[PDB]
Symmetry: C4
Subunit: 348 residues, 4 copies
């Protein structure tokens, strides 16, 4: 019994800023690489980007623009059931685009899920703070029993054991991430978390055994961080802060120092729960149309995949190697000892 006491401090975790991708032999160029991904037979994305289901990130206009760029948007749940079904319905009829919707694990959940399926949603995201809870496992079984063909994205988890549990309950996709969010204070106020790159790797190690894809959710600050998440085993990444400043996102621009900002807050923050916190309320710079951000993101992915000799995302997922570095290595990776004159489209 003494084993659990002696294993308290054995595990080690890595995050994005701890590693770099090692360049390998390459026969492919960034322009000729493929960035398509399959989450299920009914759900395939042309770019591996999903906008997060938060009240400051994704509504009708964001989900529309995401799908038009080849990605996916998850309409948040901080609205009435009919309002969310009305948002899903807007995205589907506006050219047959893909759309998702967030649902919380509550007694009224199944009523909301039914209304979303009639709007022909492609996937429901049962997103909760702790996916390794029995309430979450049961809700996935109750939805899989009622809708055997519905794409179910279950999260959030950070361990292989939680990944195996949600897969066994009938979830097609597992969303990974406890604590990496830019607006998240879970690790500070509750002390609980797993470094995101290790969380993605540990969960992808289990999901591989079942043919299940995983979503790297939260913590991505630059386009290179997305490449690290995919190379660690993730099929797709979920972004919040990098999308909150975009024009097609809910909320209006506010002025700070002559510059435009958009509100970005955690769904566990005081403000978001009104209509103990595990998030903060803030603002991110205004970034303009989604196409300009998505173009820089995909372009960094194509560059990274060319460096790794990856013709497609599966090759990157199963062959790419990292190298660990210290804090001095992180300062070398960024621009240093030179006064930056202009703001770059991919570096702010």
């Amino acid at each position: 019994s003494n084993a659990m006491w002696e294993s308290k401090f054995v595990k080690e975790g890595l995050t994005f800023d701890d590693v770099l991708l090692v360049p390998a032999k390459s026969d492919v160029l960034p322009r000729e690489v493929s960035v398509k991904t399959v989450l299920s037979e009914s759900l395939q994305l042309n770019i591996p980007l999903i906008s997060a289901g938060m009240d400051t990130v994704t509504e009708a206009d964001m989900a529309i623009a995401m799908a038009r760029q080849g990605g996916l948007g998850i309409i948040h749940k901080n609205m009435s059931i009919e309002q969310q079904a009305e948002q899903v319905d807007k995205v589907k009829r506006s050219g047959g685009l893909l759309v998702g919707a967030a649902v919380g694990v509550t007694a009224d959940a199944m009523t909301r899920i039914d209304a979303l399926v009639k709007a022909s949603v492609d996937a429901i995201v049962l997103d909760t703070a702790h996916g390794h809870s029995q309430g979450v496992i049961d809700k996935v079984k109750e939805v899989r029993a009622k809708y055997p063909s519905l794409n179910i994205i279950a999260g959030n988890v950070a361990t292989a054991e939680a990944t195996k549990a949600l897969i066994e309950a009938g979830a097609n996709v597992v969303k990974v991430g406890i604590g990496p969010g830019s607006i998240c204070t879970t690790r500070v106020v509750a002390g609980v978390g797993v470094p995101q790159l290790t969380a993605v790797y540990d969960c992808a190690t289990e999901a591989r055994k079942h043919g299940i894809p995983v979503i790297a959710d939260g913590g991505i600050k630059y386009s290179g961080d997305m490449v690290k998440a995919l190379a660690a085993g993730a099929h797709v990444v979920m972004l919040g802060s990098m999308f909150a400043g975009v024009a097609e996102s809910p909320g209006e621009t506010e002025i700070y120092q002559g510059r435009q900002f958009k509100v970005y807050r955690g769904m566990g923050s005081v403000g978001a729960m009104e209509k103990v916190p595990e998030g903060i309320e803030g603002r991110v710079p205004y970034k303009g149309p989604l196409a300009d951000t998505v173009h820089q993101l995909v372009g960094g992915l194509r560059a990274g995949m060319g460096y790794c000799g990856a013709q497609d995302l599966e090759f990157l997922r199963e062959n790419a190697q990292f190298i660990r570095m210290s804090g001095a290595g992180l300062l070398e990776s960024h621009p240093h000892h030179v006064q930056i004159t202009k703001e770059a489209p991919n570096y702010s």
Copy 2:
């Protein structure tokens, strides 16, 4: 002999910001967890929080508010014997609440302890800069001889060897912490200390063999640090800076730069002593009623225990696993890359 020379740099120590608690399978929700703890046959607490025995944190008005919230207050020793005996009696009169009192290891110590026992004190805290000194060990043995049933809290120590010595001397509770204090300069001016999370774990490993509880004293900056201290083996945590700003603490609010502050200083500082100092004098924001801080602290603990699947503190103490992370992991754990506009009640 050469063994001690070659053993100089073998040990490694971890602090709160080096680790994260791994989320586990959970059948319980934060509202349904138990935060009760037993320190001795005569000492049972409803919340695992003790106010530190400093002239800037806890006097009668603070100890009353602590006990009423389910915790414990330690009346500080910077007083005459007659003043301290009356403070214990004031807290005792207000509904039969639990209260403790700090006593230093000096020739006059037993005279002060006698007056505290007549005021019906529940626990005596034998506070010294170095708990593994022979003068402290002798004082513990003689107080156990004169008062065989009196709760004796002995500290501070940081090693398994020091913990076993105070336990064999007759102390029911051992207080752990050398150098982690927010106002403490021991590790800077004397070079001596042990990282608090390693100190708590090393001492709890020894105290666990005897059924003795340990107190994680100092270094707690956020509610998540308290969850980590308890998951590392501590029954109860002792706070100073997180309590110095509340209304029920000695001293009155001062205005600095148009904002409200309360004085907070170390008991080894120049001001508190009026040897070389091992503390500094400082300032903390006014935080309002004690209940608001206690709610945020306990609420974060309930969240952590729910993330870890702990129904009570013994499950967290015996089963919770940590994961080590780098400074980049710490940067991910905090909010990042978002301009914070509002203050959260648990994150400032």
Copy 3:
């Protein structure tokens, strides 16, 4: 399953992770030799090469570089006729050494012909990713036409890539993916190798063929150069430390009453016009005056480091110098600390 389980096994070190250990020395800083040979046709008196960037090296910089005992690489953001004119302009000024960068494009061999006609000493087949077959194929195709031409191929960061370019016919391999001061490759693509590990891994392979490597990028102080040479590199390539000298492309600009020079990455938005995704940024460095003053501090720092290590020449430093690893607290100790600096030193700013 090895490839999946080996994802996070490697560890990498950069300049600020290590220090050179002082060794027995009968050598004085003044008496060391800083000469190095890259090929039979390329001998440098100082192991310093100015980078081939449109804000770092043109004719006047290559002239001053060679006159100090080094080498300049004329950048490619110009016409073929302009670059051939820059090479000969440098060559006519006393028969000085000069190189020129050529990208892996359809016109590359057309540009290479014009450079060889100008009596260029080395072409740098410089690409963002040197381990692509387009680069290897281009090296053989250049090696076939010019058996006597010095070919510098980069950039790479692994032992496998060094062996690949050597098999294609490259005399010198340039090492560095992401360490540059103006570089965002590791930020926008997630790809890189810590430069000191990259140099060491490439030198381990390149020594097996007698091939020298160039430590390219990441050098902030003169001591970083000594660490790069002690890690296995024959010569180092500098950009930011040279962009502020008088002999460099661009004109001095005034910022806050002080004089500055533009310094930008060749993968930046501004340099690529001269919607694509950049791998560099546009910046500015303080104006530094004559090139001789910068080189004197650089060579002076190298001479001191070699004296501490007991290396009379650079080959001894390459084969004997020992490092010791340190933490961030060691880096804070290595720099000056707890003292407010009142005057700016020629080597520390």
Copy 4:
């Protein structure tokens, strides 16, 4: 093969400095007031406190060496002087009550001429101070001084390795000074890339010197009194301080006022100003005025007594031979300092 052994050991060694570690508290029966801080460097050189003021033109002259020795310590008169001035500075300290005093000598052709004038001024120890103590020029000078003066205390430095320590001992040095690059004003590790983290250097050099009965000096990098306790516990007999002494009243240079606060100039002996084209290995700076030396020494020795009590050391030999460290990360360092509290007043030992 042999040629490849040096190539594969390039990145094997690891080094620790003061901010990487903490001293582990041990069983103790002694109190800080009751400990002994006496130390013996040789039979001719015994100090009551283990503190030496550095031989720099902004740290130690006659008035500093006088005040240092009177506190039980030692001052090293710097060498940026003529031979005649340095000998009279030594004589000034000797005439002021027969106090102990040292003098710095560089390894140059004039060295032996300079040393002679110092011995006639009755100096107690000469410091053969060089940027690189493991050079053959330094080894030769120690043998050449040991040949002429068999009883003279010779302090040779600076080194950072066990091999360099053993070489200087074999050349005839009674004391070895350890420190390459840790100085607060030092840029050696930045401009030349060379150094060893000071705590590992002290430990590695004391390991060798212990075998010959030779004491070592921890030179440079000490920012707080706890750094001194760590250096002594890492194997050093005595520590040499510069920045912590450069601000005291009895040190060369005058107090200058900036923004209402009093400052003194503090610069490295490898800075342009002190040597006044060339490549410097130091910078020029400024430190706050600290008042009389007695207040700084009192806080320093007091911090040592506290640490020795935490470690159960009755004297410095017990601390050098028994004290145990524990290693910590950057987060451990932030916990060690005061944190998350706005400091209102300055403590005598902290900032």
